[PDB]
Design a protein around this ligand. Structure first.
Ligand SMILES: C#Cc1cn([C@H]2C[C@H](O)[C@@H](CO)O2)c(=O)[nH]c1=O
Ligand SMILES: C#Cc1cn([C@H]2C[C@H](O)[C@@H](CO)O2)c(=O)[nH]c1=O
Lengths: 315, 310
């Protein structure tokens, strides 16, 4: 079988991921590498009207005390549903084409973000921002699609000092500069990296749950559970009278563990120039898991889908 | 050769008697080899959020009275459906690794009160018909429907409208409001749902038949696909955006491999149970994947029952 390489570039916004993805794709031949962008058109028009604007305005009105936590929660929750839709449909239609893990790949797909950004990371960060309930975050978690073979996720590293500067220069439509949220999303993705590493080192959250009382992966020692995403869900809403988690929520953490544990995580240093990031990323692709496809004509099919998506939903 | 499992999801519009019927069925067979997974009422009322059902009907009423907008109702409705579906989504997700391929009576029989597509497809779709959910939110939920495992048997109900209205009047959940328009909306969706499975199973291709919505198996105008000829989903030239079209490809994949069975509810509670029992003879069993899958699955079902059933 001809092989496929899927690479998801993810992390907090404002690091330079989108630039890097494009520079990477620009190096390859037209028909052997494809770019799958953020579905901005879906976010802005097709799925709903100006969703990103909605998200930032809602947080702001919560901060100012013009709307309650409950009102913010219903708006955040449905906005996040909108945010994630194109990532979910795409994952669902790619799924039947992916075979076992496996010499240049016949096709490379570079994604701007993985489904877990909209289905886990931003929800979790909004929870920390007090604009979502942890129960709803766990409902998103339980709906995370099965983790396909060869899921390489690249997360970013960037000093908070540089990140804030970089963010303060940016001007994306609908966004408001919010360093509280920036701190939250950076913490959330750091926990994520740690959660994969913890899981891959044999860590079991049920065995470690009692240790709770409040980065990098594919390297280093097993993290403490308090430095993983599990620590977020020791919330009084989720706890039974006896002090343990209600089973329904523990089952969602089991789902979180199953999804994250088979992922191949790499860290990219964004503290450099765009061409630097690009070449740093290129080197990282060397140690990345490829997969087979299930039909010989899966490669063109997958190619059309990626280009159709890019054309329809890219900015 | 691993032991066998029978999964039976009893579904359909509310107010037909689905939850009485099943409780009785869970009395005949040995308490050990059959488990009744009830409606997660405790999650709906307390665990996930405060009185979700009340929240849902009150929102539709307020929109009906023109006290809130289509948009305000939709954001409220969407979040609430997420809450409603959560226990269904976790359960399916933890059960999946345990499901083997298709297959001596079943070592274990699970009877669920509803399947994940109730909260992920049917109710969202009915609320869309009710003007309180956007068709893009619906296809978002569709996009998240877990892949259809082997042996997914769904029992749907049949009941004449007037008789159903009578039962609804006495089977009102806490916070619920009697709404004959939602009743009709939800009955139509489940009607279209049954048609959609047949359409797909008989070889129907939505992309091929799509043009017929604007100009042997049901007509596409009698399937769930007709609902998504909504102007919100369409480009200036009438075409479906690809992202929605793909969500329709997922919907087709998911429903095609479900095994649907119709249970006539227009009879005595005892007769409903008897009918449900003989319906099981045609249902698909699966093996499980590990030796200890059976008692683990049992524990899941019993714990769900204990923690979330009212
Ligand atoms: C994917 C994604 C998401 C992006 N965003 C924001 C981050 C940036 O401000 C902008 C573009 O990535 O949207 C969310 O608020 N939620 C998400 O789920
Ligand atoms: C499952 C389920 C759902 C049930 N319901 C309602 C229908 C009944 O009034 C009550 C219990 O079935 O909840 C929803 O409104 N949405 C759902 O997703």
């Amino acid at each position: 079988m001809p092989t496929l390489l899927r690479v998801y570039i993810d992390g907090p916004h404002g690091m330079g991921k989108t630039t890097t993805t494009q520079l990477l794709v620009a190096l390859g031949s037209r028909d052997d590498i494809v770019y799958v962008p953020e579905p901005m058109t879906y976010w802005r028009v097709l799925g709903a009207s100006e969703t990103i604007a909605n998200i930032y305005t809602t947080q702001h009105r919560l901060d100012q005390g013009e709307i309650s936590a409950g009102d913010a929660a219903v708006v955040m929750t449905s906005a996040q549903i909108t945010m994630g839709m194109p990532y979910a449909v795409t994952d669902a239609v790619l799924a039947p084409h992916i075979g076992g893990e496996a010499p240049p790949p016949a096709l490379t797909l570079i994604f701007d973000r993985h489904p877990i950004a909209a289905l886990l990371c931003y929800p979790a960060a909004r929870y920390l921002m007090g604009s979502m309930t942890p129960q709803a975050v766990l409902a998103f978690v339980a709906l995370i699609p099965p983790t396909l073979p060869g899921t390489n996720i690249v997360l970013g590293a960037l000093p908070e000092d540089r990140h804030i500067d970089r963010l303060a220069k940016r001007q994306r439509p609908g966004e408001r500069l919010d360093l509280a949220m920036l701190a939250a999303i950076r913490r959330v993705y750091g926990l994520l990296a740690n959660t994969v590493r913890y899981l891959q080192c044999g860590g079991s959250w049920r065995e470690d749950w009692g240790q709770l009382s409040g980065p990098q992966s594919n390297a280093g020692p097993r993290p403490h559970i308090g430095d993983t995403l599990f620590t977020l869900f020791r919330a009084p809403e989720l706890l039974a009278p006896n002090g343990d988690l209600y089973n329904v929520f523990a089952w969602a953490l089991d789902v979180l563990a199953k999804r994250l544990r088979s992922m191949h995580v790499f860290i990219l240093d964004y503290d450099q120039s765009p061409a630097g990031c690009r070449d740093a990323l290129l080197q990282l692709t060397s140690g990345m898991v490829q997969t087979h496809v299930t039909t010989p004509g899966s490669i063109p099919t997958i190619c059309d889908l990626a280009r159709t998506f890019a054309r329809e939903m890219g900015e």
